[PDB]
Amino acid sequence: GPDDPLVINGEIEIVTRAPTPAHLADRFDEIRSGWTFRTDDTQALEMDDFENSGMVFVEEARAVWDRPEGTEGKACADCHGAVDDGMYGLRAVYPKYVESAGKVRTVEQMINACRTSRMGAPEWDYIGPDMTAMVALIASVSRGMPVSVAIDGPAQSTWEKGREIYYTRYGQLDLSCASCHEQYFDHYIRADHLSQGQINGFPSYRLKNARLNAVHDRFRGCIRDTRGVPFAVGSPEFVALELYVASRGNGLSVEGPSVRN
Amino acid sequence: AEVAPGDVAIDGQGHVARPLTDAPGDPVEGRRLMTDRSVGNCIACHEVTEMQFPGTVGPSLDGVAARYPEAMIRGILVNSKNVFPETVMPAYYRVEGFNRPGIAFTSKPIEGEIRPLMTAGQIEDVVAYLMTLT
Numbered sequence: 001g002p003d004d005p006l007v008i009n010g011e012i013e014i015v016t017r018a019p020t021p022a023h024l025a026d027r028f029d030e031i032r033s034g035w036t037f038r039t040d041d042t043q044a045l046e047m048d049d050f051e052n053s054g055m056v057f058v059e060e061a062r063a064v065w066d067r068p069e070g071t072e073g074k075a076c077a078d079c080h081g082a083v084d085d086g087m088y089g090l091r092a093v094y095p096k097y098v099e100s101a102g103k104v105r106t107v108e109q110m111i112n113a114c115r116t117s118r119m120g121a122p123e124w125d126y127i128g129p130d131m132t133a134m135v136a137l138i139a140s141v142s143r144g145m146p147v148s149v150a151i152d153g154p155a156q157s158t159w160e161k162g163r164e165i166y167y168t169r170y171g172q173l174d175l176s177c178a179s180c181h182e183q184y185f186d187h188y189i190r191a192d193h194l195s196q197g198q199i200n201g202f203p204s205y206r207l208k209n210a211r212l213n214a215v216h217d218r219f220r221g222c223i224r225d226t227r228g229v230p231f232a233v234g235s236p237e238f239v240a241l242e243l244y245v246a247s248r249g250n251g252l253s254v255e256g257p258s259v260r261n
Numbered sequence: 262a263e264v265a266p267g268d269v270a271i272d273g274q275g276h277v278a279r280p281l282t283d284a285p286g287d288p289v290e291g292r293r294l295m296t297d298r299s300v301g302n303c304i305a306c307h308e309v310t311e312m313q314f315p316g317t318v319g320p321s322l323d324g325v326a327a328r329y330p331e332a333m334i335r336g337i338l339v340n341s342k343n344v345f346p347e348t349v350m351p352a353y354y355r356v357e358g359f360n361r362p363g364i365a366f367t368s369k370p371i372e373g374e375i376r377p378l379m380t381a382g383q384i385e386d387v388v389a390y391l392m393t394l395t
């Protein structure tokens with residue numbers, strides 16, 4: 001049910017309802033995980049990693065983490081240590097301003113920077129399966145930690161660009177993200193129960209397509225489905241939108257990989 | 262003869278008093294268009310009990326012909342925003358002013374002329390169906 005507690009593996013408390021972030025307080029009485037809009041049967045699939053088909057890909061990425069790839073003969077682990085330590089906390093604070101880049105970066109951009117510049121290995125396609133499994137492994141080791149993305153300082157202009165996109169109507173159907181997820185959350189579009197369109201559970205394992213789904217893949221499909229032209233994955237526009245949408249869920253726990261419709 | 266998008270007479274309340282085409286509306290086709298996910302896809306947002314798994318974003322259209330005049334129902338279909346400012350209901354007879362319109366769901370930009378989501382005849386067919394909802 002919507003107000004039931006989510007615990008994972010009997011061990012990990014997930015905050016699924018939280019006070020609305022100050023920047024969004026005008027619009028919601030509280031913020032809620034997408035988990036809280038799912039039926040009981042689907043909710044149960046996220047409560048035990050043994051039942052969460054998304055975690056099969058995570059276990060594969062755990063092996064990839066230790067596997068040398070690229071001309072330099074190194075594995076992620078050779079520089080970052082055990083993934084449970086070296087990636088701890090990271091999902092909760094990206095996208096963030098990155099000192100070396102003078103820009104807000106996403107986790108995916110960081111991973112590909114190490115692959116190319118430090119490993120001598122091929123970049124992973126931004127929303128492909130290899131990248132999305134690794135981002136899911138990174139999310140999984142911070143489950144239960146509050147999403148805490150900064151929205152001011154050097155990230156402000158990026159956050160503002162994302163806010164602008166969130167409320168811009170797109171496509172011939174002429175809808176913004178807010179049209180559905182802010183104005184009409186808890187309503188239904190056909191059989192789908194509209195959530196607040198949060199991303200604290202990404203990458204999501206969708207029962208519909210039986211794979212992990214990257215944030216920018218979801219975003220692309222949402223603008224497409226307004227009968228519109230999405231921005232490119234990895235584009236400045238979707239990096240901005242991701243920072244902004246992540247901040248609409250500040251205070252909810254990291255949940256990825258979550259199980260969703 | 263159909264009145265082209267640019268030409269519809271629209272009063273101050275968003276009502277449209279005259280049909281968009283001289284062809285009579287076929288309510289049977291109207292029914293099909295509304296549940297055609299490729300055309301009206303109206304059931305995504307609206308329940309009609311006369312007609313599975315309707316959305317709840319819009320109100321039930323049960324009874325709409327008993328409460329709203331034909332001209333108002335037609336106005337809702339031509340450009341819902343004229344009737345319900347800032348509604349999320351799509352404008353089915355508009356061809357201008359979209360941000361990043363794509364060719365259906367192919368993610369490709371529309372180059373050249375933009376056609377309306379429904380034709381004048383499709384709209385009168387749908388209107389004819391809605392008018393049976395008393």
Ligand code: HEC
Pocket residue numbers: 065074075076077078079080090107110111114115118119134
């Ligand atoms: C040494 C040759 C490395 C290998 C192999 C990999 N990474 Fe890396 N990574 C490296 C450095 C020197 C840094 C910057 C650290 C800093 O504090 O500035 C990074 C950073 C990342 C990050 C961002 C970390 C953070 O604290 O914000 C990520 C997400 C990351 N690296 C991922 C990653 C993965 C998935 C790798 C295997 C494919 C990998 N790195 C290998 C150095 C090296």
Ligand code: HEC
Pocket residue numbers: 033034035037166175176177178179180181189192193194195196197198199201204218219222223226245260
């Ligand atoms: C109505 C026509 C929508 C518009 C416009 C946008 N979204 Fe959407 N989204 C919609 C549905 C019916 C669903 C599935 C049910 C639900 O959980 O809401 C979604 C889902 C998402 C999600 C996934 C949520 C999760 O896994 O917990 C995200 C992240 C999402 N939508 C984002 C999003 C954005 C950023 C949009 C503007 C570009 C947007 N959606 C528009 C319906 C609709």
Ligand code: HEC
Pocket residue numbers: 295300301302303304305306307318319320321322325334337338345347348349350351353387391
């Ligand atoms: C959601 C994205 C919608 C789709 C798709 C369609 N309609 Fe709609 N409609 C919608 C809303 C939210 C509303 C209420 C106005 C508001 O913005 O609050 C409506 C209303 C109507 C009405 C008037 C009914 C009434 O007010 O009692 C009619 C006659 C109507 N809509 C018809 C209609 C048709 C025929 C559609 C498919 C072509 C259709 N709507 C799609 C939201 C949405």
